[PDB]
Paper text:
Ribosome assembly is a highly complicated process that engages more than 200 protein assembly factors (AFs) and many snoRNAs. The earliest pre-60S ribosome is co-transcriptionally formed on the 3′ LSU region of pre-rRNA in a stepwise manner. The maturation of pre-60S is coupled to the dynamic association of approximately 90 assembly factors, hierarchical incorporation of RPLs and sequential processing of ITS1 and ITS2. In this study, we determine the cryo-EM structure of pre-60S at an early nucleolar state.
After three rounds of 3D classification, 98,155 particles were selected to reconstruct a density map at an overall resolution of 3.65 Å. Domains I, II and VI assemble into a native-like substructure, but domains III, IV and V are totally absent. Therefore, the structure represents an early assembly intermediate before the global architecture of 60S is established. A total of 12 AFs and 19 RPLs were modeled in the map. Five AFs, namely, Nop7, Rlp7, Nop15, Cic1 and Tif6, are also present in the early nucleoplasmic pre-60S and adopt similar conformation in the [name]-[name] pre-60S. Seven AFs Has1, Brx1, Ebp2, Rrp1, Mak16, Nsa1 and [name] were newly located. Rrp1, Mak16, [name] and Nsa1 form a cluster bound to a junction region of domains I and II at the solvent side. The structure demonstrates that the global architecture of 60S is first established by domains I, II and VI, which constitute the major part of the solvent shell of 60S.
Residue numbers in the entry:
A (entry chain M): 261 to 267, 351 to 396, 403 to 433
B (entry chain K): 69 to 119, 125 to 235
C (entry chain D): 55 to 105, 127 to 322
D (entry chain M): 88 to 173
E (entry chain E): 88 to 220
F (entry chain H): 31 to 51, 71 to 305
Write the structure that this text describes.
RNA sequence: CCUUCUCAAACAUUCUGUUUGGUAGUGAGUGAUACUCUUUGGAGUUAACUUGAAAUUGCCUUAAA
């Protein structure tokens, strides 16, 4: 929320994922989700948002479930802990 | 001490219920507050400053004014406290209304009457002409003070108390 | 004490229920059978009130869609009659101020007109669901201990997964799709949740608090309507901000 | 004592009036006195992020008054708007 | 000496044996409660009779309530002389119309239409005013 | 369908029966009676009817009663929110054309409050004869007006659909009070075997109106409701025959 | 110490029109005229009158403490 309007980042520890985005499931942790994907350039898409009902540049994904069944090709997986 | 018949007619008042009813009525009729008159007269002030008056209603509470309504006679019911600092003031009302056939009613406390009127005290507050809404509740009300207070309490006229 | 007034008061209040719902059932007679020879109208409705007060009419014609249910007291004068008390008893909403979701199909729909003058009702939104479950909900659980006539706050994913191992469900945010997008039967999600106890909008019997109590008696006595016609169309409101406050 | 006063008597209208006529004071002098000016403000705030985010978590009960919750969470989202946009 | 019963008049709408016994039991358990209801179009006659236990309970409840006011109604309640024997006014209801007809064929009923109309023109012939048909 | 000359000899020789020397207002009223096997069953229904008639005995009721003792006059019931929309002096600009004007436009809110107190009620409604209302309220009128003034076809309200589609505007009140006025004679359809429409007052227009009325009304209701026998009288009268129908009589055997 | 069924579809596009629907009462009593009924069972219906919402015995708990 909060569209932020007017009237370089940490050099370069942040500002990663240059024109690069993530996807997240519903199952991803809710309190911590948009944090550094908003703090390091990119998009967040939660399956939870689709409980209202992008999916293009998405490569990395996040699943905290014990298992993922099944995968998706062009999406290079990481658990939530990866973001750390 | 033994107290004269014209006193001890106070100390006989209206019950929990009948009083409760009387205020169920008058609490409709609270004479408008001061900030109220400031309200309406400010709004109309701006209105007729740039840009049909039914007769207002309240209870008529001035002691002088009240006895003035009686002896005409005007009023319908009168509420009389049991405690006046100069207890003298009201001693003649219950007789007066009596001889004039007016429904006087003793209601306990001058703070209790005083609060319905936007004052600290009244010791007398009464009404004559009422809106038609409660007119039936009036006719029955006075019928209830007749029936409760008035009826069996002729005895209070004699009998030194105390 | 009885306060004899109160006696008659309850009585007449109760009567307005009976004669109401009785009429309603006879409407529920002639909207059950399409036996109509001469009736008012065979079509039900929903009355949608939003906020100066902007209103309108529609018909549900389901199309299952969840009504959101928030119970608040009313109409303060009444002994519950039979059929109302039971139709609630399913939703267990006695011991009032119990919020709950209910999916509404057209076998859910006409049974409403009994509940109309009790809970205030409206389609919720996402953040109302997630936000309303995230702060509340309780699970009756037994294991490792606990003969347990006792209720457990929601933390442990062991119970989350474990009791949801039937449906292959972890992480009650799964139930979000089960709810927000209304998953399979939806039912054991909410029966699971052991639905909700709101905090009253404004607490009571205090000095400044008493003011707010009156203001609530005002707005609550206006926006809560009825017909009492047995043709009374249901009332629907936007509950989102209502639950910004109440939860 | 005034509200319990009129309200003791009655006169809902008056009570409303006082309800407006009141006001809450402005802390602001002590913000400039106690933490002048910019950095001294930043200084200990994190202690206020503990509580800002704790209460902005809290489920609404009495002596919580979901207002407090609402501005709390909103200024969370504006803070995090300033870091996350920052 | 008066009775143990209490005559009650002026009975508002929503005041019945539920409410009658309900309230008046506070004066002791009462033997009898009757409200006089309407033979049709179900509602009351706005008065009813009672009896409690003993004459004293009737004293208590009566005098306590004799002029008591409620809703729109002040309730005149008072005992009766010795005995007075509450007897009748069973609980009534609104007795719905039972329709039996018409068992006969148009023979005697359409006849009685005939003879009745013929003798009708007889009647207006006695008036006398002369018509037809 | 029926013979004209029949009911014409009945109405003129009826003027003979009323030629012989309040009580007058009792006598002179001409009433049309009608029967059937049974009227609409096991429901007390207060629904009224707008008849289409040769003309209205309203206007004669007015003018001939302008000197009367009772001096009837007009009501109508608005909804809650339309009151402030339609003023009294609004609708006066218009109604005059037909020579017809209401007195008072009240809200049932005022009936439920100031005009309750059943003596204040019945004394407020009993000085009227012709009534109006609106449908949307008429559904709510049973409890308010109370069991007295439905005992007179007089006082029992006609209904009307005032509201236009949607968001009512006054034009349909202007013309539609005329619609409820000029061509229409409301009438009531109770239970039982018997209904007598209250028709007219003899001292009004020559039988040329009344006989035609008898026609249009008679064959009107004959159609739908399959009546048994039809009479006419003057309030007092041993009944006067017109159309004696045993044809549809046998329909009694139809169902039984 | 209670607060009242304040609208529907249909049809035809006309600042509105057409049409069908949707309404069970405070009670008490005056009453001369009928309808209708069915085996005495008198049942439903017929003008219009009086009335202080008058009287006497028609088999959920925060609207607490």
């Amino acid at each position: 929320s909060y569209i932020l309007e007017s009237r370089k980042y940490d050099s370069p520890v942040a500002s990663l994922f240059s024109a690069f985005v993530f996807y997240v499931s519903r199952e991803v942790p809710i309190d911590i989700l948009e944090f550094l994907i908003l703090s390091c350039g990119g998009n967040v898409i939660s399956e939870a948002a689709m409980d209202q009902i992008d999916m293009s540049k998405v490569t990395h994904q996040i699943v905290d479930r014990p298992v993922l069944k099944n995968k998706v090709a062009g999406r290079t997986y990481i658990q939530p802990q990866w973001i750390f | 001490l033994k107290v004269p018949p014209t006193i001890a007619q106070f100390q006989y008042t209206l019950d929990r219920n009948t009083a409760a009813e009387t205020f169920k009525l008058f609490n409709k009729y609270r004479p408008e507050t001061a900030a109220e008159k400031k309200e309406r007269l400010t709004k109309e002030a701006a209105a007729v400053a740039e840009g049909a008056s039914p007769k207002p209603y309240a209870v008529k509470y001035g002691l002088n004014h009240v006895v003035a309504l009686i002896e005409n006679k005007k009023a319908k019911l009168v509420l009389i406290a049991n405690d006046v600092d100069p207890i003298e003031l009201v001693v003649f009302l219950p007789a007066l209304c009596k001889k004039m056939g007016v429904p006087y009613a003793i209601v306990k406390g001058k703070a209790r009457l005083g609060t319905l009127v936007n004052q600290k005290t009244s010791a007398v507050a009464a009404l004559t002409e009422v809106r038609a809404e409660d007119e039936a509740a009036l006719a029955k009300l006075v019928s209830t003070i007749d029936a409760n207070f008035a009826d069996k309490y002729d005895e209070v006229k004699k009998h030194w108390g105390g | 004490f009885v306060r004899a007034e109160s006696i008659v008061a309850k009585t007449l209040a109760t009567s307005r229920e009976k004669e109401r719902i009785k009429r309603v059932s006879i409407l529920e007679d002639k909207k059950a059978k399409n036996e109509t020879q001469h009736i008012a109208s065979g079509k039900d409705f929903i009355l949608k009130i939003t906020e100066g007060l902007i209103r309108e009419k529609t018909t549900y014609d389901g199309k299952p869609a969840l009504l959101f249910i928030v119970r608040v007291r009313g109409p303060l004068a009444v002994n519950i009659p039979n059929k109302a008390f039971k139709i609630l008893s399913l939703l267990r909403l006695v011991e009032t101020n119990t919020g709950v979701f209910v999916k509404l199909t057209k076998n859910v729909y006409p049974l409403l007109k009994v509940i109309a003058p009790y809970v205030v009702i409206g389609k919720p939104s996402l953040s109302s669901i997630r936000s309303l479950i995230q702060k509340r909900g309780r699970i009756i659980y037994k294991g490792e201990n606990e003969a347990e006539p006792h209720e457990i706050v929601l933390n442990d994913n062991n119970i989350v997964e474990e009791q949801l191992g039937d449906h292959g469900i972890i992480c009650v945010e799964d139930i979000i799709h089960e709810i927000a997008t209304m998953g399979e039967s939806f039912s054991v999600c909410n029966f699971f949740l052991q639905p909700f106890k709101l905090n009253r909008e404004v607490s009571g019997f205090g000095s400044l608090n008493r003011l707010r109590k009156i203001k609530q008696r005002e707005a609550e006595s206006r926006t809560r309507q009825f017909s009492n016609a047995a043709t009374a169309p249901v009332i629907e409101v936007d509950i989102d901000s209502l639950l910004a406050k109440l939860n | 004592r005034k509200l319990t006063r009129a309200l003791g008597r009655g006169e809902v209208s008056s009570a409303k009036r006082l309800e407006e006529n009141r006001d809450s004071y402005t802390l602001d002098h002590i913000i400039k006195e106690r933490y002048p000016s910019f950095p001294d403000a930043i200084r200990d705030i994190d202690d206020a992020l503990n509580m800002l985010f704790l209460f902005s978590n809290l489920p609404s009960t009495n002596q919580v008054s979901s207002k407090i919750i609402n501005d709390a969470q909103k200024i969370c989202n504006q803070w995090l708007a300033y870091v996350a946009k920052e | 000496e008066y009775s143990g019963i209490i005559y009650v008049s002026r009975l508002p709408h929503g005041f019945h044996e539920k409410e009658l016994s309900k309230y008046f039991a506070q004066f002791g358990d009462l033997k009898e409660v009757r409200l006089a209801r309407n033979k049709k179009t179900g509602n009351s006659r706005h008065y009813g009779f009672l009896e409690f236990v003993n004459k004293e309970d009737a004293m208590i409840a009566q005098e306590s309530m004799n002029n008591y006011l409620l809703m729109g109604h002040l309730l005149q309640v008072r005992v009766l002389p010795k005995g007075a024997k509450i007897e009748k006014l069973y609980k009534y209801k609104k007795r719905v119309l039972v329709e039996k007809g018409i068992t006969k064929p148009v023979k005697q009923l359409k006849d009685n239409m005939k003879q009745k109309h013929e003798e009708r023109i007889k009647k207006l012939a006695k008036s006398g005013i002369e018509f037809k048909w | 369908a029926i013979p004209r000359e029949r009911v014409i000899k009945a109405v003129n020789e009826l003027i003979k029966f009323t030629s012989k020397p309040e009580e007058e207002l009792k006598k002179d009223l001409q009433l049309i009676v009608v029967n059937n096997k049974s009227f609409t069953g096991t429901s007390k229904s207060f629904k009224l009817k707008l008849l289409n008639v040769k003309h209205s005995f309203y206007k004669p009721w007015k003018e001939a009663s302008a000197t009367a003792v009772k001096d009837f006059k007009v009501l109508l019931i608005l909804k809650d929110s339309d009151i402030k929309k339609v003023s009294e002096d609004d609708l006066f600009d218009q109604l005059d054309s037909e020579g017809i004007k209401v007195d008072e436009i009240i809200c049932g809110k005022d009936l439920k409050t100031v005009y309750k107190a059943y003596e204040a009620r019945n004394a407020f409604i009993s000085q009227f004869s012709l009534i109006l209302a609106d449908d949307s309220i008429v559904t709510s009128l049973p409890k308010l007006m109370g069991g007295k003034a439905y005992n007179k076809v007089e006082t029992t309200p006609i209904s009307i659909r005032t509201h236009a589609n949607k968001e009512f505007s006054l034009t349909t009140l202007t013309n539609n009070i005329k619609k409820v006025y000029m061509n229409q004679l409301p009438v009531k359809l109770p239970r039982g075997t018997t209904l007598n429409v209250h028709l007219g007052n003899l001292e009004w227009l020559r039988p040329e109106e009344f006989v035609d009325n008898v026609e249009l009304i008679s064959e009107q209701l004959i159609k739908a409701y399959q009546i048994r026998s039809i009479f006419i009288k003057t309030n007092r009268s041993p009944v006067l025959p017109l159309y004696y129908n045993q044809d549809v009589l046998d329909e009694l055997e139809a169902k039984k």
